[PDB]
C-alpha cells in the first residue's frame, strides 16, 4: 500500500519512511526511478522504454563544482520544478522529518554526483532556502543508503559550509537531525575545529568567522571534547597543543576524505 522499494540505476533500495507519491504509485511492488531525470514509473516495462528514450545524463541546472569525477549541480526549485519535486519525494523515503515536497520554489538544491562514461550518477543532495530567516545553511541533507558512511555525507557538509564562507555568513543545519546526521555533523565540526586549533591563537568568535560554524555549534562541540572552560558567564577555549594532537591522531579521523577543492568551486552569492 505504501511505496516500500525503489529501483534506481543498478540499485534496489528498501524504503525507510512514508513518502506521499500518488496512491496508485504505491500499489506496486516497486517504483522505478530514472536516475538522471528522476521520473518515477509504475512498471519495469515503462522504465525500460524510458531508459532508451531519456536524453538526460546529468542533473539539470548549473555545474558549480567539478573535480575529477565528483560534481555538484545547483538546481533552482523555481526553474526545474518537476525535477526538484521528484527529488523531494525520493528523499522523503529516507528522511523522517522532511515535510515539503511540492512547494519547492523557495529552495535551491545541490545535487552530488559521481561521473563515469555513462553519465553523472546521483549520490545525495542538500536543499537550502533562498532566504533563511533563522540562518540555516542546509534545510535537508540526504545521502542515498548505499552511499552512506562512505565519505559523501562529509563532502556535502563541508560543501554547505564552503557556500556559507563565500556568503560571509555563519550557518547551521535546520533541526532536527537524524541519528546519523547528528553523528556526522559532530564529527565534521570536531575535525574542522581541531585542525584550526593545531594550525594557529583563536577565540570562539575567531573560529566561527574562519569556519562559518555558529558559535553555539562550536561551543557544544568543544564541550564534548572538554576543551572549553567557563569564566564569569563566558565560554573560553582551554586547550593545549598536545591534547589537540591526541584527538587528531584518533582512529575516527583516519579515513581519507573527499575534500572540497575551493579552486574547483564556481559560485557567487545570489
Ligand atoms: O553518509 C552519511 N554520513 N557518513 S560520512 O560521509 O562517511 C562522514 C564521515 C565523517 C564525518 C561526517 C560524515 F558525514 C550520511 C548519510 C545521510 C545523511 C547524512 I547528514 C550523512
Ligand atoms: Zn529520464
3-state secondary structure of 15: coil
What is the Cα–Cα distance from 18 to 4, expressed in whole angstroms? 8
3-state secondary structure of 204: helix
Q: Which of 244, 26, 35, 51 is nearest to 144 (CA)?
A: 35
The CATH number of the domain covering residues in 185-246 = 1.10.10.10
Adjacent-strand bridge partners of 141: 126
Residue 143 CB-half CA count within 13 A: 17
Is the dihedral angle over the CA atoms 254, 256, 257, 259 positive or is it negative?
A: positive
DSSP 177: P
In this structure, the number of other CB atoms found within 10 A of the CB of residue 150 comes to 13
In this structure, the number of other CB atoms found within 10 A of the CB of residue 266 comes to 12
Q: What is the Å distance from ligand 1's center to 144 Cα?
A: 11
DSSP 146: G
Residues near ion ligand 2 (CB < 5 Å) are 34, 37, 39, 54
Residues near 115 by Cβ (< 8 Å), separated by ≥ 6?
58, 69, 70, 71, 121
**Residue 112 cell numbers, joined:** 552530488
Q: Which of 114, 142, 148, 188 has the most ligand 1 atoms within 8 A of CB, as the residue to mutate? A: 148
What φ, ψ does residue 177 adopt, rounded to 5°?
-95, 155
Q: Which of 235, 239, 240 is nearest to 220 (CA)?
A: 235
Amino acid at each position: 500500500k505504501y511505496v516500500d522499494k525503489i529501483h534506481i540505476g543498478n540499485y534496489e533500495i528498501d524504503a525507510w519512511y512514508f513518502s506521499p507519491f500518488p496512491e496508485d504509485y504505491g500499489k506496486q511492488p516497486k517504483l522505478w526511478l530514472c536516475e538522471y531525470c528522476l521520473k518515477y514509473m509504475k512498471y519495469e516495462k515503462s522504465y525500460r522504454f524510458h531508459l532508451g528514450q531519456c536524453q538526460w545524463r546529468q542533473p539539470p541546472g548549473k555545474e558549480i563544482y567539478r573535480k575529477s569525477n565528483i560534481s555538484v549541480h545547483e538546481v533552482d526549485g523555481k526553474d526545474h520544478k518537476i525535477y526538484c519535486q521528484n527529488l523531494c519525494l525520493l528523499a522523503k523515503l529516507f528522511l523522517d522529518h522532511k515535510t515539503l515536497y511540492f512547494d519547492v520554489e523557495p529552495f535551491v538544491f545541490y545535487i552530488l554526483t559521481e561521473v563515469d562514461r555513462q553519465g553523472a550518477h546521483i549520490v545525495g543532495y542538500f536543499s537550502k532556502e533562498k532566504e533563511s530567516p533563522d540562518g540555516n545553511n542546509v534545510s535537508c541533507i540526504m545521502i542515498l543508503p548505499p552511499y552512506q558512511r562512505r565519505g559523501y555525507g562529509r563532502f556535502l557538509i563541508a560543501f554547505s559550509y564552503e557556500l556559507s564562507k563565500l556568503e560571509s555568513t555563519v550557518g547551521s543545519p535546520e533541526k532536527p537531525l537524524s541519528d546519523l546526521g547528528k553523528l556526522s555533523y559532530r564529527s565534521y565540526w570536531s575535525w574542522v575545529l581541531l585542525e584550526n586549533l593545531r594550525d594557529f591563537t583563536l577565540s570562539i568568535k575567531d573560529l566561527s568567522q574562519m569556519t562559518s560554524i555558529t558559535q553555539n555549534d562550536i561551543i557544544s562541540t568543544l564541550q564534548s571534547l572538554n576543551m572549553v572552560k567557563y569564566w564569569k558567564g563566558q565560554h573560553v577555549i582551554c586547550v593545549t597543543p598536545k591534547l589537540v594532537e591526541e584527538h587528531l591522531k584518533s582512529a575516527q579521523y583516519k579515513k581519507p576524505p573527499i575534500t572540497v577543492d575551493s579552486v574547483c568551486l564556481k559560485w557567487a552569492p545570489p
